[PDB]
Enzyme design. Structure first.
Site, mmCIF file in Angstrom:
data_model
loop_
_atom_site.group_PDB
_atom_site.id
_atom_site.type_symbol
_atom_site.label_atom_id
_atom_site.label_comp_id
_atom_site.label_asym_id
_atom_site.label_seq_id
_atom_site.Cartn_x
_atom_site.Cartn_y
_atom_site.Cartn_z
ATOM 1 C CB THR A 168 19.509 -84.761 63.990
ATOM 2 O OG1 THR A 168 20.296 -85.852 63.498
ATOM 3 C CG2 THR A 168 18.073 -85.237 64.154
ATOM 4 C CG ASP B 244 17.695 -84.012 59.304
ATOM 5 O OD1 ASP B 244 17.385 -84.445 60.435
ATOM 6 O OD2 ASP B 244 18.872 -83.972 58.890
ATOM 7 N NE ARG C 291 23.562 -83.111 55.675
ATOM 8 C CZ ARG C 291 24.001 -81.906 55.323
ATOM 9 N NH1 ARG C 291 24.531 -81.086 56.226
ATOM 10 N NH2 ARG C 291 23.909 -81.517 54.057
ATOM 11 C CE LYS D 48 18.586 -87.829 60.734
ATOM 12 N NZ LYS D 48 19.202 -86.531 61.096
ATOM 13 N N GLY E 114 20.852 -87.373 68.927
ATOM 14 C CA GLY E 114 21.923 -87.779 69.834
ATOM 15 C C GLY E 114 22.674 -88.979 69.289
ATOM 16 C CB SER F 224 22.528 -80.011 65.540
ATOM 17 O OG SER F 224 22.163 -80.732 64.378
ATOM 18 C CG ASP G 190 21.867 -78.027 62.170
ATOM 19 O OD1 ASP G 190 22.967 -77.649 62.627
ATOM 20 O OD2 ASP G 190 21.400 -79.165 62.386
ATOM 21 C CB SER H 88 19.690 -80.659 59.744
ATOM 22 O OG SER H 88 19.682 -80.799 61.152
HETATM 23 MG MG LIG Z 1 27.508 -79.773 52.592
#
Ligand SMILES: [Mg+2]
Ligand SMILES: [Mg+2]
Ligand SMILES: [Mg+2]
Ligand SMILES: [Mg+2]
Lengths: 226, 195, 196, 212, 204, 125, 232, 222, 195, 196
Positions: free
Chosen positions: A1, A17, A19, A33, A47, A129, A166, A169
């Site tokens: 994230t 993001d 994901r 989010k 988290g 992250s 990342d 993300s």
């Molecule tokens: Mg991938």
């Protein structure tokens, strides 16, 4: 994230993001989010996903009741105080890490809050992250007296850094802009730089491919008359 | 406790339960009856942690007997098994859970059908033609899978049960001192005194 | 963290760095560790940010309610409320707080409340991970009844060294001056204090 | 995993499943758990795949050296003991092996040795090893006779693995059959459990619990 | 030991053109031991379908709980609950056990009776909602299901084409999981007809 | 101290009347008129802002109150009783519905919750 | 098996059109204590290679001696030691990579993360990474520790793939490296303001810059930040 | 405490055709949530028409490949430049792996090539040397996502002929190299969508009697 | 392995050893002979860790047979037992000790006396009129303490042994699948094929 | 322990406290932590007394054998021998050694060898548990090319503060002066340095 918050001239912008993951597996490729505490107070969470949602909605509910009781529009400091006191009481067991942003009669605000109950103030913040990738971008390009357009650009660029660098993300960029004296504008899928390419083959089966033992109609209707 | 088996045939349910009670080093008893009659046409066998097994079984028995008196009516095997499941499902998140696995063999007088329910200590319920708890199924299910028929007589069920017990006596390391066998049918519950 | 409070002729000054770390990552490089619990009673926080924020908020509440009933509280009274929270909840807290305030009757006072919840009234106090490196410097350079400018220099120099050696300390040096004249905030940037 | 081997009038039947798991994950359904040590000796593979493969292949090399040096077929007794003595040297180091060394010689007749990584070496008539061993034993014990025909013995071994493949989650895929004679082993095919189950259910009338 | 993989099993749900599909395997086990091949994991409350994987006692308990709650909902509201509303109820109910959760992986599937819009959703054991447009997976073979669904799925499939797609996704995923299989069921759901099909698969 | 009034203050009289409810209705009768009309594409509720003094700012006194974004309320009778009921009604819309179903309650069910609160003040101690 | 005691933080690097750049700060930390302030962590090997090392400093000093010995050894009975048979970046890397993997395989690692930056005989850019596990990889940009999380994202905006390398000048690359070092100083608690930077160019050779400082820092905005929520 | 192992992610896939064989792998190298390289080749041409990949812990993977390439070199020296057959290479790799049975190479190894009859061949190994000739094998991070798909689309598992309803299986007709590459690309595209460690690029090595050919394809970089 | 018993009577030593071999869940064999003939008039039974038992027994057998050939002479039971004790005493401080307990039953042809030695895996040797290893003594010694007489015949020894086995079969939780019984006397070693 | 070595105009001076503790018990209050490995190469020891004594004894042996063959060793050479022992045996040692020496060619030199076995040549060095409290003081008060008297005062003042705050340090302050003139031992008692 990856989540960021950026202050500008006449307001604040928050981005994230899209994901959501189950370990190394991508559960949802277009998660939302960016959450609403009140019309002009939005937050983004990292988290434990159930904790970040449950805590937003609880404080959002109580904020609404407070607004009705006081005949006043909700303040960001109220959401913050209510969030941190709730989280502190549970000693980090509610794994909610949030960036809270909004506008109210007092002005524009930007805060971060951690699961144990600590809060911070800032002009630019990042969480999740992908926070280090995002903050690298913010520390490189942030300046005082940003315009609305510059802040949206900076915020989405910071999220992109997380998306590409990342593994936690990815996918799209969501944005929400909260300007003073205006409606907050939620920009779902503001950027879409990760559309899947067309597959080489169609995997549509011939009808009758699957072996079947029994067929039956399922009665979803209630008990009938006559 | 150790081995509890169950088989539902044409017109009855047969429960077989070991007789041994072992406290660590010694076999303290070789004639223990690991079962309780919940109602005239419903029998429950049990196995698990010492003390909790009998405590749970007698608690269930008392509750079903209470219901029977209050309503002047015998609950169906399905209803009894659901009540038992809920009690175990409640128990698993308690301060100290009942570590008890049960088989419920009952004859439904309304439907004129035998019924066998297998419930473990978590509250995991399944209705089966034949069932077991612990390691008993590991030795016996391959025999039951082969020979079982839904139209078997009670005598054929007992013969298939003997084959299961023989396989247990051959390949199991523990001496469970034979089994007590009980039959549940339209006439109620009776014990096979020679097995 | 590097925090300190120093009494001087006209009152007291609180000083702090602005670095907040999560391991080796600097989560906030412009943190404000000088917190107001009353008009002229402030505190420096060290330890768990969650704990010290929660404590300070409760103290601010207690002193606001005290003031409504009994008028302006003493710095000793504020320190006592801090202590009561820290001592009674010592098993569940990680907080090291320095309390500083100005009365007209008592003038500048400093109280330090370490981990256990004990209270110690001192002429000056230092705390935080960075304080270890300046026990020698501060002991040699502190004087009683310093001027405002001397005290600012003393804190600036002291926290400069603390920041220099402690990785957990850094950023800007914030200061709050408490006198009869009022409340003054000061800030000093790296390019200033690093060349000292 | 499920493997069995039993002695009978016509020699030895070896039957195994084909499944390999890494936790719940089914890594393979096409695993060869019978190892052709040589044209006369078979080994089963349970425990460590590599430990069984590696050391029973090595065993074949030792058996070949024996018959080169002694100009005589190695006994099942001697072959099994070479393997058991080897793994005993490694005891404590963490080898995982459960195998049946199966053979048919003049002096011995049909012979099976259960060899195990903690040093056990047992001669016997019927052995079953693996996560599904208890299911296979049930079918074996109730149907085994010395005077079984080669045809009926092959089926019994096939049916016993099927029993295990059905009930044991970590057994399945397909059934491999072997018949060990004095003149060597004879392979009797790979049998998909999916197809075999339905075939056996219909023809035998077994597995009434399962809807087909 | 791991409560979510003692009993085994899987659920998958997909959306199509004016339809949804939800499917499950029929296995219940005690680790390696197969116990039941008739343990259905899909339930329905009116026109809303709920699949639940995980610890079987919790699966049974939750079905009974949602039957209870949806029955009271209907009596009070004088109408059947909708998929969107039921999804929130599942989320609410799961999170109220935040520090002593049910070890389950629920999946909601249905069509809104008023808008006609197809709906699916998934949850973790404490109520986090995953509202995917395409498909939702759950169980001990969720990794395998993600792989099948990602490659086999295409949007706007007709009911009879969606049946083949979801059936093959389940079947082949289950055959790569030791704790899934022993039969399978697929529900094909349209605005006012629902068909239920039992699939023929390998029984190992 | 302690609330030692654990008994009902509303009770049936020999004629079957619940006196306190009848008297409450009498208080409502004295109250300022309020009304409601339902149309095909809406509903209207209205009342008079009977200002107690011309120095009072009657805009600060809200007789018509938002309960949810799609539900409103007006009253006749005792103003203070109304105000606290509005507070309770707003909260119960969240606690017994929105926090469960993620949406605001339908009119009839919120009414049902308010009605329950008023019923309990007629039987509770 | 050991634990690192005196440590060096991030090493960052990238390729550009005619060569490579590498940089690393001059700090030797002792846990949270910023103990040693004049530590050179970029070690040149000849005029074509620079090895940047992070992690345990005692192990760095050992590696530094191995490299010094490597140069001595290569010159033995080698008339072309300063020509065709001079040490290449690829020779130096492979040697280090061999050592690192051997040491981890004896369960006695050199607690480091190493980046070898250089230019080959044919003018090709060399940039490859190796660490205490013997893990190796190459990329247009490489960074260790915190640099991996904060510097790479910034450096990858300049050179995102192989085709971006010929488009990247030395001025643009150095600018990006210097900015990344500033960002790390802002955000890494085990970093220092002072750092070294080395450029290895196929035309201008090795340029080694010492005593560089992070400059043009933004701090003024800190004056407006008050409290942690409600404080004015 | 020192951990001598690591996880560099990655996913590989080997498919054996009738007269060819492919060994594919993504080019992304990672630790934890960071990307080390977007292009770090993982599948190697080892000589004698053999391709190899050792996926998992990259240091162990590089060491094993390096040692096997060396084994090919010494096989030529010792046995009069004889070509190392794929079956002989497989057995040789078993011994390389089992030689470290008590301190394993933390990798899943796959090799591909042609057998001595010219037919496609793929061999799969576990970390300690157990191996098998296989038709189809995915390895690494997203192996669990890919293999079920391959069972369905390569071996036609659970697919029956329409009209027969489960009585007649879909016949196992041979796939062309173009058909296989489609399945490989679709496998990695799907894996990239749902696995965070998969992405950046796809490199495929194709082996025929004519030699070894390479193909590269971009994958999503998020 | 499990139960090994020994009894020294007037003119012979009798060793009884269980037939079961259990590998965790299943009983793999029910006819296992847990003994080795070391010399014509010396028998050793054994029990302990899997693999190590047979490995140790055969190693001892090979060594005694080697001695017999070298000297053309049978070592006394006492001499054999001392050799065995030293090997186990050596083993207990090794890298990986033999986890093996033994009974050595021998007839001394020089003294014309039966002799029974009990040695555990530590190298703890005792000469006894009757002995056992593991839990076997806990069930059987009270019977042996009561009935044993130094002048018992072989037949009386076998009868007392039957009573011991019966008590074991009653009170032991494990099914050890009966015992193989062997007699050691002046004429050598023979097996009682019906017990 | 509080130890330091400081270079100055005429050479180098080593300084140390004299306290050796076993937990809270002072096992020796008059310890000599300044040890001679060669005529004008000394060291300050911190960490395990057993380890640092063993190491120093081995170094003294190495330098005695070096001198017999190659003449007087350099301070750099001595530091290298120390390092070689500390680095190669890092798993089994707990030693923090400062090496100080005087050459005529190189004059006063100071090398510090911390726990890991790394070497650092410095103008001055501080080590031991008590050094943490004087990083600030020493950094602010050290100057290059000080006189003998200034350097003695600098060390005296520095170790005075280290002793003041560190319970593991105390007793007398021992010093060894290394110059061209020779080797001079100094001692300073509590009544002297405590009043500074
Ligand atoms: Mg991938
Ligand atoms: Mg600092
Ligand atoms: Mg199976
Ligand atoms: Mg399966």
């Amino acid at each position: 994230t990856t989540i960021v918050g950026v202050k500008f001239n006449n307001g604040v912008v928050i981005a994230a993001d899209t994901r959501s993951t189950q370990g190394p597996i991508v559960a949802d490729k277009n998660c939302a989010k960016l959450h609403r505490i009140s019309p002009k107070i939005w937050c983004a969470g990292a988290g434990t996903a159930a904790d970040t949602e449950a805590v937003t909605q609880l404080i959002g509910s109580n904020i609404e009741l407070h607004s009705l009781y006081t005949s006043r529009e909700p303040r960001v400091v109220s959401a913050l105080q209510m969030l941190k006191q709730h989280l502190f009481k549970y000693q980090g067991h509610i794994g909610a890490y949030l960036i809270v942003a909004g506008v109210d009669p007092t002005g524009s605000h930007l805060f971060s809050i951690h699961a144990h109950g600590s809060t911070d103030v800032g002009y630019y913040l990042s969480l999740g992250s992908g926070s280090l990738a995002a903050m690298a971008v913010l520390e490189s390009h942030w300046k005082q007296d940003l315009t609305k357009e510059e802040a949206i650009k900076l915020a989405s660029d910071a999220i992109q850094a997380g998306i590409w660098n990342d593994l936690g993300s990815g996918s799209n960029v969501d944005v929400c802009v909260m300007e003073i004296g205006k409606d907050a504008e939620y920009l779902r899928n503001y950027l879409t730089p990760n559309v899947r390419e067309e597959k080489q083959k169609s995997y549509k089966f011939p009808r009758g491919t699957t072996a079947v033992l029994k067929e039956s109609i399922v009665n979803i209707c209630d008990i009938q008359e006559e | 406790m150790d081995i509890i088996l169950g088989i539902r045939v044409q017109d009855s349910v047969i429960l077989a339960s070991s007789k041994a009670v072992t406290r660590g080093i010694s076999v303290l008893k070789d004639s223990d009856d690991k079962t309780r009659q919940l109602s005239p046409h419903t029998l429950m066998s049990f196995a698990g942690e010492a003390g909790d097994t009998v405590q749970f079984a007698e608690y269930i028995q008392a509750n079903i007997q209470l219901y029977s008196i209050r309503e002047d009516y015998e609950l169906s095997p399905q209803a009894v098994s659901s009540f038992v499941r809920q009690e175990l499902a409640k128990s698993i998140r308690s301060r100290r859970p009942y570590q008890v696995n049960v088989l419920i063999g009952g004859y439904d007088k309304k439907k004129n059908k035998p019924e066998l329910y297998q419930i473990d200590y978590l509250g995991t319920k399944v209705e089966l033609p034949y069932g077991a708890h612990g390691y008993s199924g590991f030795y016996t299910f391959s025999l039951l899978d082969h020979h079982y028929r839904p139209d078997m007589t009670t005598e054929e069920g007992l013969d298939l049960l003997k084959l299961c017990v023989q396989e247990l006596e051959k390949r199991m390391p523990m001496d469970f001192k034979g089994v007590i066998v009980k039959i549940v049918d339209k006439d109620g519950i009776r014990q096979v005194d020679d097995f | 963290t590097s925090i300190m409070a120093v009494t001087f002729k006209d009152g007291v000054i609180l000083g702090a760095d602005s670095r907040t770390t999560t391991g080796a990552y600097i989560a906030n490089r412009v943190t404000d560790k000088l917190t107001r619990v009353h008009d002229k009673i402030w505190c420096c926080r060290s330890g768990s940010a969650a704990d010290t924020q929660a404590i300070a908020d409760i103290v601010q509440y207690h002193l606001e309610l005290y003031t409504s009933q009994y008028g302006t509280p003493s710095t000793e009274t504020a320190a006592s409320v801090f202590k009561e929270l820290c001592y009674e909840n010592k098993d569940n807290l990680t907080a090291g707080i320095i309390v500083a305030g100005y009365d007209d009757k008592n003038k500048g006072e400093v109280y330090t409340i370490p981990l256990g919840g004990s209270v110690h009234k001192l002429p000056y106090a230092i705390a935080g991970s960075g304080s270890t490196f300046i026990y020698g410097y501060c002991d040699k350079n502190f004087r009683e009844n310093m001027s405002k400018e001397e005290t600012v220099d003393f804190i600036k120099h002291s926290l400069s060294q603390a920041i220099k050696w402690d990785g957990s300390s850094g950023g800007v040096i914030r200061m709050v001056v408490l006198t009869a004249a009022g409340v003054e905030r000061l800030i000093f940037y790296p390019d200033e204090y690093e060349q000292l | 995993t499920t493997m069995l081997a039993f002695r009978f009038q016509g020699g030895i039947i070896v039957a195994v499943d084909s499944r390999a798991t890494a936790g719940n994950w089914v890594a393979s359904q096409t695993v060869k758990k019978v190892i052709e040590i040589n044209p006369f000796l078979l080994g089963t593979m349970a425990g460590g795949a590599a430990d069984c493969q590696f050391w029973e292949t090595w065993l074949g090399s030792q058996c070949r050296l024996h018959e080169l040096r002694e100009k005589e077929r190695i006994s099942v007794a001697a072959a099994s003991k070479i393997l058991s003595n080897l793994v005993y040297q490694y005891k404590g180091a963490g080898l995982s092996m459960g195998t049946m060394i199966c053979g048919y010689t003049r002096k011995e007749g049909p012979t099976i040795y259960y060899v195990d990584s903690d040093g056990t070496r047992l001669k016997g008539d019927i052995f079953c090893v693996g996560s599904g061993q208890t299911f296979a034993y049930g079918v074996l014990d109730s149907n085994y006779k010395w005077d079984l025909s080669v045809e009926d013995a092959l089926y019994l071994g096939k049916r016993s693995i099927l029993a295990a493949a059905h009930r044991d989650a970590y057994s399945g895929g397909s059934v491999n059959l072997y018949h060990v004679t004095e003149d060597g082993w004879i392979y009797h095919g790979n049998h998909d459990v999916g197809e075999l189950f339905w075939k056996v259910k219909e023809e035998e009338g077994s597995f009434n619990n399962v809807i087909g | 030991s791991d409560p979510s993989s003692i009993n085994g099993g899987i659920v998958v749900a997909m959306t199509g053109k004016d339809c949804v599909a939800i499917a499950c395997d029929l296995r219940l086990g005690s680790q390696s031991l197969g116990v039941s091949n008739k343990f259905e994991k899909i339930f329905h409350y009116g026109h809303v379908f709920l699949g639940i994987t995980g610890l079987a006692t919790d699966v049974t308990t939750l079905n009974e709980m949602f039957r209870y709650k949806t029955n009271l909902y209907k009596l009070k509201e004088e109408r059947a609950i909708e998929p969107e509303t039921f999804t929130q109820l599942v989320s609410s109910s799961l999170y109220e056990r935040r520090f002593g959760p049910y070890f389950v992986g629920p999946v909601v599937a249905g069509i809104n009776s008023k808008s006609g819009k197809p709906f699916i959703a998934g949850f973790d054991l404490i109520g986090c909602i995953d509202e995917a447009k395409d498909f939702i997976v759950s169980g001990t073979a969720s990794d395998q299901l993600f792989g099948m669904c990602e490659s086999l799925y295409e949007p706007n499939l007709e009911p009879e084409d969606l049946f083949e797609t979801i059936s093959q996704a389940l079947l082949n995923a289950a055959d790569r999981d030791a704790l899934s299989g022993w039969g399978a069921v697929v529900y094909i759901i349209k605005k006012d007809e629902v068909v239920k099909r039992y699939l023929k698969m390998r029984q190992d | 101290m302690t609330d030692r009034y654990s008994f009902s203050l509303t009770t049936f009289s020999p004629s079957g009347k619940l006196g306190q409810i009848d008297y409450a209705l009498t208080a409502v009768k004295q109250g300022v008129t309020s009304l409601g009309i339902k149309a095909t594409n809406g509903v209207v509720i209205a009342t008079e802002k009977k200002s107690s003094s011309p120095l009072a700012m009657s805009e600060t006194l809200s007789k018509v109150s938002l309960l949810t974004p799609d539900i409103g309320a007006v009253y006749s009778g005792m103003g203070p009783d109304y105000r606290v009921l509005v507070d309770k009604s707003r909260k119960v819309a969240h606690t017994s519905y929105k926090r469960i179903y993620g949406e605001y309650p339908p009119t009839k069910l919120l009414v049902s919750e308010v009605a329950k609160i008023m019923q309990e003040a007629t039987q509770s101690g | 098996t050991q634990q690192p005691i005196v440590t060096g933080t991030s090493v960052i690097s990238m390729k550009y059109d005619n060569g490579v750049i590498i940089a690393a700060d001059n700090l030797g930390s002792y846990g949270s204590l910023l103990r040693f302030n004049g530590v050179e962590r970029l070690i040149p090997v000849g005029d074509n290679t620079v090895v940047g090392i992070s992690g345990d400093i005692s192990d760095m000093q050992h590696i530094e001696r191995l490299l010094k010995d490597l140069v001595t050894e290569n010159a033995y009975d080698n008339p072309l030691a300063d020509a065709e048979e001079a040490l290449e970046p690829s020779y130096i890397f492979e040697y280090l990579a061999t050592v690192m993997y051997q040491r981890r395989s004896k369960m006695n690692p050199l607690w480091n993360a190493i980046i070898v930056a250089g230019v080959q005989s044919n003018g090709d850019q060399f940039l490859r990474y190796v660490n205490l596990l013997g893990v190796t990889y190459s990329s247009p940009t490489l960074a260790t520790g915190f640099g991996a999380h904060m510097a790479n994202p910034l450096l990858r905006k300049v050179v995102d793939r192989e085709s971006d390398i010929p488009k990247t000048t030395v001025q643009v690359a150095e600018e990006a490296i210097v900015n990344a070092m500033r960002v790390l100083y802002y955000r890494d608690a085990r970093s220092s303001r002072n750092f070294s930077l080395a450029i290895i160019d196929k035309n201008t050779g090795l340029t080694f810059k010492k005593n560089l400082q992070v400059e043009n820092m933004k701090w003024d905005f800190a004056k407006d930040i008050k409290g942690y929520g409600t404080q004015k | 405490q020192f951990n001598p192992y690591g996880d560099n992610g990655g996913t590989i896939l080997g498919i054996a055709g009738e007269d060819f064989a492919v060994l594919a792998g993504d080019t992304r190298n990672i630790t934890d949530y960071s990307i080390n390289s977007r292009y770090e080749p993982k599948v190697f041409d080892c000589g004698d028409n053999i391709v190899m990949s050792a996926n998992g812990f990259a240091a162990d993977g590089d060491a094993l490949v390096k040692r096997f390439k060396n084994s090919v070199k010494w096989y030529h020296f010792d046995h009069n430049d004889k070509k190392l057959s794929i079956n002989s290479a497989a057995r040789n790799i078993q011994h390389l792996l089992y030689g470290k049975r008590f301190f394993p190479y933390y990798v899943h190894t796959i090799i591909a090539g042609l057998d001595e009859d010219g037919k496609g061949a793929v061999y799969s190994f576990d970390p300690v040397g157990s191996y098998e000739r296989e038709q189809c094998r995915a390895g690494g991070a997203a192996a669990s996502l890919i293999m079920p798909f391959l069972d369905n689309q390569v071996n036609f598992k659970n697919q029956y002929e329409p009209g027969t309803n489960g009585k007649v299986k879909k016949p196992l007709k041979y796939l062309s190299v173009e058909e296989v590459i489609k399945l490989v690309r679709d496998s990695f595209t799907s894996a990239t969508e749902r696995h965070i460690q998969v992405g950046d690029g796809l490199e495929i090595l194709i082996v025929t009697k004519d030699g070894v050919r390479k193909e590269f394809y971009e994958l999503k970089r998020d």
